Amino acid sequence: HWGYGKHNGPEHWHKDFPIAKGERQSPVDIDTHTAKYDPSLKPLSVSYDQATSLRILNNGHAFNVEFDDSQDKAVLKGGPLDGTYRLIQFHFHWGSLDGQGSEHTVDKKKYAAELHLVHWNTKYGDFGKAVQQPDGLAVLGIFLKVGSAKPGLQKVVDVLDSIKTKGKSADFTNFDPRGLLPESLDYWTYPGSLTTPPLLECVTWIVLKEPISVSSEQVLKFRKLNFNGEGEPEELMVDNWRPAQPLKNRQIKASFK
């Protein structure tokens, strides 16, 4: 099965998921000089005050914090989006060293990690239907760099010991994802795909310009997780990122000058 190892990593995915070589694959490098300011873009609207977290889960590829998306509790709108998209989960991608970890890069710069807040377009009724549509998901991507601690990340970091191995989950209620946002909502946007199998081309990517800072100790705890299940040989969960894919016939738009 697919993973991030030498024998089942990104370079092999196309054999089971041929869309891996498709026309709107993610992630990509954001060339800041070629991206165009688009004054018709509207500000993002992130309304997370009513967000309800339920659970955190190690799924063998990352850890997901899952939310109740049975109603409009935590939603994203505005920007390039038409309609209302509901927050269903967030997760991270990270590296074995501070100089790598992000999926998107900026002028070829790699960050230590990348946060993905996954939202689905409510006009399609459920998440499973939304992924089959060109405008089905909106993912908010936020870069992490190593510096000062991010306080609002700490509750996530402290539960990681209870979900060390694949398939473990733990209750994770009353977590406020607002504590993971940077100060500015300036963004780049382009049409793309899931960055993991099944690699569906269903995503409107919204990547924030401003990284958040986390501490070395915070990221160190991400790297203590395992890809494997309990009682299998230990493999540290690190470098769970897909490299940049060709931009092809796409323009990246910027919300800011």
Ligand X SMILES: CCN[C@H]1CN(CCCOC)S(=O)(=O)c2sc(S(N)(=O)=O)cc21
3-state secondary structure of 53: strand
Residue 52 binding target from Zn ion, ligand X, none, CB below 5 to 8 Å by type? none
Q: Are 170 and 234 in contact (CB under 8 A)?
A: no
Do 185 and 47 form a contact (C-beta atoms < 8 A)? Answer: no
Burial classification of residue 44, based on how many CB atoms lie within 10 Å of its CB (0-12 exposed, 13-18 middle, 19 or more buried): buried
> Which tokens hold the place of 256?
């800011």
SS3 content of the chain, % helix, strand, coil (to 5): 15, 30, 55
* Dihedral pair phi/psi, residue 73, rounded to 5°: -100, -50
Please report, as residue ranges, which positions from 51 to 80 form the binding site for ligand X (by CB under 6 A): 59, 61
Which one of 12, 14, 61, 104 is the catalytic residue? 61
Only one of the segments 35-43, 159-167, 171-179, 194-202 lies at the binding site for ligand X (rule: CB under 6 A); that segment is 194-202
Decide if 1 is catalytic: no
* Out of 165, 196, 204, 245, the residue judged to bind ligand X by CB under 6 A: 196
Asked if residue 93 belongs to a known ligand binding site, the reply is yes
Structure tokens, 92 = 């991270």
Closest distance between ligand X and the C-beta of residue 37, in Å? 25
116 binds Zn ion (CB under 5 A): yes
Residues in contact with ligand X, total (CB under 6 A)?
A: 11
Cα–Cα distance between 216 and 99 in angstroms, integer? 12
Stretch that binds ligand X, among 48-56, 161-169, 175-183, 189-197 (CB under 6 A): 189-197
- Residue 197: CB minimum distance to ligand X, A: 7
- Between CA 199 and CA 194 the distance in angstroms is 5
- Do the bridges between strand 63-67 and strand 53-58 make them parallel or antiparallel, or are there none, so unpaired? antiparallel
Q: Using CA atoms, how far apart are residues 252 and 37, in angstroms rounded to an integer?
A: 9
x/- site string to ligand X, residues 73 to 112, per CB under 6 A? ----------------x-----------------------
Query: What is the total count of residues that contact Zn ion (CB under 5 A)?
Result: 1
- By the criterion CB under 6 A, which residues form the site for ligand X? 59, 61, 89, 116, 118, 131, 139, 194-196, 198
| Interaction site with Zn ion (CB under 5 A) | 116
Residues making up the binding site for substrate: 195-196
